[PDB]
Amino acid sequence: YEKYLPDENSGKYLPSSELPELNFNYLASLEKLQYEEFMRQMNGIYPKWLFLILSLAKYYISDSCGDLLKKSLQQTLRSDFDRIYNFYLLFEQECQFILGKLKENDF
Amino acid sequence: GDHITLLNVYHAFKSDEAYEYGIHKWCRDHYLNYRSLSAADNIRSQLERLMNRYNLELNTTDYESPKYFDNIRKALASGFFMQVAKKRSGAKGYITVKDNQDVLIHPSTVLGHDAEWVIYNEFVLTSKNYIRTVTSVRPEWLIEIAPAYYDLSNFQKGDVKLSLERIKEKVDRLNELKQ
RNA sequence: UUUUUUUUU
Question: Which of A75, A97, A100 is closest, CB to CB, to B167?
Answer: A75
Count of helices and strands (H, E) across chain B: 7, 5
Of A26, A25, A28, the residue nearest A6 (C-alpha):
A28
The CA distance from B172 to B153, in Å, is: 17
Residues contacting A29, CB < 8 A, separation 6+: A14, A18, A39, A40, A43
Residues of the domain holding B39: 1-179
Number of structural domains (chain B) is 1
Encode B136-158: b = buried (16+ Cβ within 10 Å), e = exposed: bbebebbbebbeeebeeeebeee
Instruction: Give CA B152 to chain center in angstroms.
Output: 23
Resolution (Å units): 3.5
Name B84's bridge partners: B119
Interchain contact A75–B (C-beta under 8 A): yes
Residue A30 CA and nucleotide C2 C1' are separated, in Å, by 58
Residue B124 CA and nucleotide C3 C1' are separated, in Å, by 9
Of A69, A46, A57, A83, the residue nearest B90 (C-alpha):
A69
Name B15's bridge partners: none
The CA distance from B62 to B67, in Å, is: 9
B167 chain-A contacts, CB cut-off 8 A: 75-76
Which experiment gave this structure? cryo-EM
Instruction: Give CA B2 to chain center in angstroms.
Output: 7
Give the DSSP per-residue string, B146-175: -TTTS-GGGSPSS-HHHHHHHHHHHHHHHH
Residues lying close to strand C (Cβ under 7 A), chosen from 22-41 of chain B, are none
CB B160 within 8 A of CB B89: yes
Give, to the nearest 10 degrees, the angle between helix A64-76 and helix A80-92: 170
Name B132's bridge partners: B122
Of B156, B149, B107, B152, the residue nearest B127 (C-alpha):
B107
The CA distance from B167 to A6, in Å, is: 41
Name B134's bridge partners: B120
The CA distance from B25 to B19, in Å, is: 9
Residue B36 CA and nucleotide C6 C1' are separated, in Å, by 14
Residue to substitute from B167, B168, B171, B174, interface A, most A β-carbons within 10 A: B167
